[PDB]
């Protein structure tokens, strides 16, 4: 009987190409491979159909949808995604129809990684004072246009600050994630700290930690800044 197994997870960097496997075993002369997208609804939009018999391949593209560049199939009927983009991050189903030999299907997740832009930081130059009795708004950090979402941490004198997200009198960091119109993700974080006199001499920066294929990570540091203190 026909059987089909594929890698359940494929990862690619934004802009690079990938070919999703669909190599069944147990087929007879004549079979068809069909590619679909799918989501949590189980709806299955058709992308392409390939029919193989002996010395002929037949291909019908179906997407409409309008990807740029278009999907393609290779000579073995596999799905080719040239120049992967965040929109291509989803699950793909290959179904093989093999006549008397039966049918089988297999799903793969494609994850697409986009490194965010250079981390930007915007210190509060208007109101900070080492004489102000509250946790003050120190600075805002922006890490834009990545996938998946980056995470931001803050530093003082080269040391990571362990601040929670919950508001309190001593220090905390807030964050917001936004989905850009492109589908990419941007994070903003604002640091709040109770200041001490010696903060006048401290350097600060934030860093965006981003994920990469194969369990890897990178870090993008903001420029370092010193506080502008008002007396």
Swiss-Prot record:
Disulfide bonds join 22-94, 141-206. Wide tissue distribution (highest in the pancreas and very low in brain). Closely associated with the basal layer of cells in epithelia and the endothelium of blood vessel walls. It comes from the Eukaryota. Residues 1-111, 116-226 form the Ig-like V-type domain. It is found in: Cell membrane. Homodimer. Interacts with ITGA4:ITGB1. Interacts with spectrins SPTA1 and SPTB1. Transmembrane glycoprotein that functions as both a receptor and an adhesion molecule playing a crucial role in cell adhesion, motility, migration and invasion. Extracellular domain enables binding to extracellular matrix proteins, such as laminin, integrin and other ligands while its intracellular domain interacts with cytoskeletal proteins like hemoglobin, facilitating cell signal transduction. Serves as a receptor for laminin alpha-5/LAMA5 to promote cell adhesion. This is Basal cell adhesion molecule.
């Amino acid at each position: 009987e026909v059987r089909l197994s594929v890698p359940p997870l494929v990862e690619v960097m934004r802009g690079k190409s990938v070919i999703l496997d669909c190599t069944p075993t147990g087929t007879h002369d004549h079979y068809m491979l069909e590619w679909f997208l799918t989501d949590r609804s189980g709806a299955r939009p058709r992308l392409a159909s390939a029919e193989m018999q002996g010395s002929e391949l037949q291909v019908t593209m179906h997407d409409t949808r309008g990807r740029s560049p278009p999907y393609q199939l290779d000579s073995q009927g596999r799905l080719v995604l040239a120049e992967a983009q965040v929109g291509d991050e989803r699950d793909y189903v290959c179904v093989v129809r093999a006549g008397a030999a039966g049918t089988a299907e297999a799903t793969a997740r494609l994850n697409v990684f986009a490194k965010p832009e250079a981390t930007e930081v915007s210190p509060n130059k208007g109101t900070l004072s080492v004489m102000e009795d509250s946790a003050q708004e120190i600075a805002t950090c922006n890490s834009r246009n990545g996938n998946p979402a980056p995470k931001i941490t803050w530093y003082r004198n080269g040391q990571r600050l362990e601040v929670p997200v919950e508001m309190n009198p001593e220090g905390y960091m807030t964050s917001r994630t936004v989905r850009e119109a492109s589908g990419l993700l941007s994070l903003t974080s604002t640091l709040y700290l109770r200041l001490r006199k010696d903060d006048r001499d401290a350097s600060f920066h934030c860093a965006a930690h981003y994920s990469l294929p194969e369990g890897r990570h990178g870090r993008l540091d903001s420029p370092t800044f010193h506080l502008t203190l008002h007396y």
